[PDB]
Nucleic acid binder design. Sequence first.
RNA 1: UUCACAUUGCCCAAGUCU
RNA 2: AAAUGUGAA
Length: 803
Amino acid sequence: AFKPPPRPDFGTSGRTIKLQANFFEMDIPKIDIYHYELDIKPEKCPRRVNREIVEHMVQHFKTQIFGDRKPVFDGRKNLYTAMPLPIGRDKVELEVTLPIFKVSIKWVSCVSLQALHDALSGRLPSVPFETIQALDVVMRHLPSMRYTPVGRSFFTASEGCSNPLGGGREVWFGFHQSVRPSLWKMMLNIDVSATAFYKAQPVIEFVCEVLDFKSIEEQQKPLTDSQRVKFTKEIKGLKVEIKRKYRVCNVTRRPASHQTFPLVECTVAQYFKDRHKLVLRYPHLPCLQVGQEQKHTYLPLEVCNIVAGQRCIKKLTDNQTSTMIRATARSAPDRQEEISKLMRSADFNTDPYVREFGIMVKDEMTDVTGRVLQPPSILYGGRNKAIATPVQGVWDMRNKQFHTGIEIKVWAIACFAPQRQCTEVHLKSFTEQLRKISRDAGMPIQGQPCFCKYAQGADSVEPMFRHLKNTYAGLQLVVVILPGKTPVYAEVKRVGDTVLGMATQCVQMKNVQRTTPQTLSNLCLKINVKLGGVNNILLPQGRPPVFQQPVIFLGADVTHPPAGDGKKPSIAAVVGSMDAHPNRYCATVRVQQHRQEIIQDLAAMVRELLIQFYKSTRFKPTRIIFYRDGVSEGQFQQVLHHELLAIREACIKLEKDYQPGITFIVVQKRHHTRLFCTDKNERVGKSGNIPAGTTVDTKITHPTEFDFYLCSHAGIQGTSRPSHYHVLWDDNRFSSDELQILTYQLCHTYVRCTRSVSIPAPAYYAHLVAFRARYHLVDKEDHQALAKAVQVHQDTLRTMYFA
RNA sequence: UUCACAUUGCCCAAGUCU
RNA sequence: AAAUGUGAA
Ligand SMILES: [Mg+2]
Ligand SMILES: [Mg+2]
Ligand SMILES: [Mg+2]
């Protein structure tokens, strides 16, 4: 449960394709560098402040310590130098003055880059973490000064263009930068990015922006509260400057002319007229209470400016979002070009600090050979038992019938949309079309709905469903029409999934008024699965050898609360295959600690899923394939430490000695590796993306470990994110080819569409489950209550309610 | 709430002071 | 999931 397995071999399957990766080769010297630990009192100050302190420090003490040695600083307690310092390691305390600080400089170690060169070969067997860290600190020293660091990215005011979002917000552009070891050479991962920022404008113009004013006046009216309430919500927590900066903690109720503070008591507009000799042009407008809520101070809006690129955590409005989308949307070629020209303009080789450490960065994207894996054949049923052949990640169901289609005899229709908008004629025609498409697909809706009744409000949901369950024997499904976005949906799912155990299929009103064969088809894809039907299976003879023995496939995912929240739970979801196809899955879901990635209650979930697998197949899995979504590198060791063991436990407590082999695969969809077609005649579609099946396990992958990029999806828009798969454990000793082919084929078993999805079907179902859980908890966000809300009905346990 | 793909929001990362 | 856009038998 400790070390990830070494890469067994390289993939051989599929035709080759010339690709370019946004990785940039790094020439690293084979010389020692020097680590130094720093201590700065006080330490409660921000990272950038510490950077400033160290900069001033290096400047001042050039003649007795530093001097022509150009150190790098990680913003905390680490400083690296190329050539050594006058250190014994006799610790020297320095006193620094910043427009008042005590600094401790003590030597720690000599980071060997030669050992890193060894490790990159197979000559060392482990990759030195601290060394990679050092190189990273070096690469991001200068841009941490010149730009605004956000995570591993840097953003800045666009050179004379602007991109306003409204509300005092504008688009800032920038780039993610990272240092990664690879099979070949150190790599600088660079990718273009963009995000929202508050314009460094006067607070007055911010008010104009926020309250939709053309300009103040209209008016000199000391606002409403709708103005005061909204403006206060917008500016609170944001920094404002006058030389002196402050954090806005409140907005006064009284105008500057009247707002009073104890000096005897005095008013703001008067105090600024006496001590500061200024006369307010806009006195009627309120004041900003800055600093501590505790105590007082009050600054007029007219003498305050926003600061200096403050990332705007708050959520973007619908219109702002639309603007951002419109601004940052680009095709794969356009993305590629933007990244390239970014790397040209950046000119890393002239950076004095990377120059100090003898580091070279190639200004060209790395050339890498990919392999385009062959898609599996999708076997259908009915009389024909037709075979669909995925072409560029896509196929369809025309003239195909479900492998096992559910015969719908008893069903109901509940419309919560106003009858004026959704008429019985609309329902009738929609029903006719649906019955036709469903008949074609092999899912015969053989009757008219035994029930059809309009209703309104969430309060009407439970009684209506309770009637339906009690009135119609053998009721298979209730189709619910909804008037757009409504709190009724979450309710329907609450009653259906957790309260009554009834199959419900919702459809927006607009998709009833105007039906199309495609929409209806996909809808049937959902309905059939929801009623226990097998849409289609992988061609049994086209599957990898692993299927010769009974094997279970587990999807696993954790979904965390949105940015800003601090009390909502994280949600764990684990699904498990219930046949040899593999097609049917069952779900398990838990609530757990806020922002905990490690699946706390995993063993129980795996036990449930194994039990259900046995009851479904009468087989005990000899192999457990575990697709774990969302775990970053920095968390691998832990997660595998807890989760892998949790699986073993789950087996151990089930039967001794039941020890099926475990393959633990971390799925990463969200990273900064982008692959582009080298040949223009290879780009697919309008977005010009790499074709589905594109597999990369060389050159840019891990120097010693079992990992691979596999873009399994047809890129419709923008630049495809190739899913990265990292194998943390593998008792079954998969070869690269078998595991990659298996993953790719699994990407074709996703029931909700006749396409090849970007991640394996089980992990996707895991996502859907976690999200449905989040739906059951809406407005319900101690432990026992949330857990209760998240627990499905006994008749829903063994279904695919999440489809 | 037909569906996938993209951008954002989600562990690690970052951010936090006078 | 949600906002926003591209798409589809
Ligand atoms: Mg997740
Ligand atoms: Mg953290
Ligand atoms: Mg959408």
